[PDB]
Symmetry: D2
């Protein structure tokens, strides 16, 4: 039972992940000011005891540590550099923790401008999904200002199962991209396997039973198969997110001349899925890219 | 479980067959063994097996004969070649092919064996050398249901569990899909660990993070530890996984179903074979990524 | 103007390619006996002066040189080894020229059985398309019995623009697969290019115009693009044939541990096209694998 | 023989392409001021009659139309926005023609800043290679300011075989990326074919001879094969440039949810070639990615 920090916490982006994080931060006794581009999404947290912030700039100005959890590099950059953005609220004292999954260049550029105005910066992307976020069981990958990482102890314990500190700014982005590349590629392979079973007159259910008896058995494999078997593609992690992470993972490899053919093939299947309107369903809807 | 009265034959004392036979003998079966190379049989005579001279004669001597060889080419040769399984079949004899082959091969072999009064069951196995030694294989069977039931004590000895998947052909198709998934995942894991290496990240830390995530599995952990220790001693030969990928793609071809993930994994494994990794563990595909 | 051989010529398989070959053989004054699994296809050559054969065995028994031109390895093997097949008509002296595109193992196995019964064997797969076949402008790739190659001079000159002799049985199969791999992969690339242009608001027509001004300009590129632009996918070379050739080319690489990723990718796109019912259209119908 | 424009012409970037362009501009009687980040590359051009500019800003300030031909989006952006860059020299009326191959977002961002200072902007990327640039036989793809395109008539005729005007800014970038995607993918395929031939005991020379008798015969196919057969990988078009164009083409497809699996595959082979130190050889050096 860790006791919560005195520090006034701000939170920007009440999305699929952010929403669960904030809940758990409030459950565990933190003082939190929330903001979201769409005001309506804040209502449920105001009810759980959050303060409603008017802009990112003002949230940062009011709070000691501000977390942000948005979708893209484009969104992360806009949140910081746009009008009434984070940067406008930064002064010596203020700390910003970016939990968005972006590329290392984005995180480096953002850390630089923030530090240039007297701020402190930590990247802390998260590995998990809506359910894990709601349950407060995310795996947190952090890099940057070590002191700030230690200040976020109670926060990371509320939102998370465990936390890794990976050194200098850039490293958490690089690792998160690799973790998600593995996840996204495996999902493509699972969907390829289930649809091959279907089409060759084999039982998908029996394929899953066999796989669960083997060495490859995992919570992920079982859960994503069950989704497909039930026809349930309600998003636990958005397909568009995983395709983004694959795209960026491939770019990381490009940057160091390292072929990533498995990721490259996965990416093209996910692009097909997006062309078939699956962007806002679960990543498991890549299954629809294989359907005849 | 009490072992069957039936005289059991076993052909092919390879990576998988060797463990199966050991477990059959441990659990009290009467077993006659044969292997193209005679020397591999010596340990098994010491563990109580009878030495068979030819596949034909083992089949002729035994009630149920299991075979476990590498390829479709080897499975076909073992049955159709001189002193092969077919020459020993007569009304009532039973053959259980545990090799991983394509559906056409298993169909062709079933048909010739049945045509001479034999009974046929396909029972490919999912696992590796260690699981085979431990008697913890997952068995996928298809064909003659009565023969499946007769193999009860044998399957319980060699296996953790068993599936019966219906008509001949279905176990082949399923096994290829299972292995396609495994093979493609291994290519992805290798791609992930090498990308970590080359980008200044810790491979060990990558594994630690993956082990805290939802993707944590015995397979993931074991195969990563192999790579991290530089240990590519074969638990499942790389050449076998590339064979299975090749056949899984051929299965898809037959029903016009693209398998691009498999296709990509297959080319990586082909590269590994060109770098002389065929007789190492499937995890040696890691070497196809090394700069 | 080359004077036609005395030899009685047989021809098995009056398909997309075979039909034009036979026409040109008759135009140039050869005595030809034709056979086709479907008897009705042989009618067209009655007025052109062909004799109608009843079975492959009988055609081979009657003729000095018998050409075959069928679709797959399966078909080539069945034509030889099935009931009243080519093998049953072979006796010392008889000559068989297989013009089907198959793998080297198939041609090797077929050559061996035919020679075992006193026959002579040449493989002479053809590069071209229905139009070139009709015009007598095929490129012929031959391997095997050199004497038989020289005996086919007048036939090859009738049906072909030019001919290559590539040595021992197996070599023409291997070369033909590589030629078709290149062609099939290129066609996938062209379709990828035209569809990307469409979807990004560029003019397909102008893409072609630019390509025709560059160093890549070829009859093939122009012709297949004009098909796509006109929506005309009437078969000049069946899509299913090109996918078969890609499949086999990948198998050839497999056999010598040589990755063929470009072919592997092309092959998966062609399989998609087949799932979308394009098997019997032109290979350019792979375009429909890209359509949103 | 067209009469050269009165206008003072500036040229930035005397690389593989720029060098030939400038030589032809001078041959055809234009007044040209040249600049290059490395000063020494300008020396030949003073002999051939060019004025030596000190900075990009100053060249733009001195000239009526300034052409730029640099490697990357990163280089194009730095050339314009860096210290003493193009932007610092722009004033109402001045014209900039960017001939670098970049993505549409880069060309858009650059056109906007230049126009914001009263400049006029045209994108005019070029299709060809060092030899065609030297011969003045490039294909020019232009988009943006139509008036400026017409003012460049003498320049484009000196440096080019032909020119296309594709409309609004962005369109030339998109088209160029597609053209290069096709070229780059095809080169990968050709390399795959020649190496497969090698490894399976066939003659690469004979493969080329057969292809030259077929419908796929092109200057490109012949030239790139002859390079490989002679072991001559001296750059006509840098491999790094073709891999950049493939990467950007794939990014273009990402942007509109269009899978480009052929490009994706080619890109991974080129990345392997870069990992084998082939970046500064001809694009045909992708051959070395296949060598056992
Ligand atoms: N033509 C022929 N005729 C008779 N026997 C032959 C023939 N070819 C190989 N073999 C035998 O099969 C065994 C090869 O299997 P191994 O490489 O150990 O691999 P595993 O046991 O790991 O593989 C078993 C299956 O499970 C999975 C995998 O995909 C396989 O299908 C070995 O005992 C061989 O005899 P030898 O005399 O010792 O060389
Ligand atoms: N940051 C920066 N600032 C100023 N100048 C720079 C910069 N970076 C590179 N460059 C210059 O770009 C030129 C590139 O030359 P080259 O490699 O021969 O390329 P090519 O002519 O072969 O290719 C040109 C384009 O055509 C198509 C292709 O895709 C390319 O986009 C070269 O003269 C460089 O100057 P340097 O001092 O000589 O090194
Ligand atoms: K927690
Ligand atoms: K057991
Ligand atoms: K002719
Ligand atoms: K010119």
């Amino acid at each position: 039972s860790i006791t919560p920090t005195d520090k006034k916490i701000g939170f920007l982006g009440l999305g699929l992940m952010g929403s669960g994080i904030v809940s758990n931060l409030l459950k565990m006794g933190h003082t939190v000011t929330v903001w979201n581009r769409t005001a309506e999404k804040c209502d449920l947290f105001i009810q759980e005891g959050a303060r409603l912030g008017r802009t990112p700039a003002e949230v940062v100005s009011t709070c000691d540590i501000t977390f942000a959890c948005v979708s893209d590099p484009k969104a992360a950059k806009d949140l910081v550099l746009g009008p009434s953005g984070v940067l406008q609220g930064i002064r010596p004292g203020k700390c910003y923790v970016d939990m968005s999954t972006v590329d290392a260049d984005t995180v480096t550029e953002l850390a630089q401008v923030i530090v240039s105005r007297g701020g402190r910066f930590l990247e802390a992307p998260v590995s998990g999904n809506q359910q894990l976020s709601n349950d407060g069981m995310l795996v947190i990958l952090a890099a940057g200002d070590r002191g700030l990482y230690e200040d976020c102890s109670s926060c990371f314990q509320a939102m998370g199962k465990t936390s890794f500190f990976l050194g200098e700014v850039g490293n958490a982005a690089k690792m998160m991209l690799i973790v998600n590349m593995v996840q996204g590629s495996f999902m493509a392979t699972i969907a390829e396997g289930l649809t091959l079973a279907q089409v060759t007159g084999q039982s998908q259910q029996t394929l899953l039973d066999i796989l669960n008896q083997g060495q490859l058995a995992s919570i992920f494999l079982d859960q994503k198969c069950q989704n497909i078997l039930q026809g349930n593609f309600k998003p636990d992690f958005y397909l568009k997110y995983i395709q983004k992470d694959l795209r960026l993972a491939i770019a990381l490899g490009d940057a160091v001349n390292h072929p990533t053919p498995m990721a490259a093939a996965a990416n093209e299947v996910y692009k097909r899925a997006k062309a078939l309107d699956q962007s806002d369903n679960d990543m498991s809807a890549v299954y629809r890219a294989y359907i005849h």
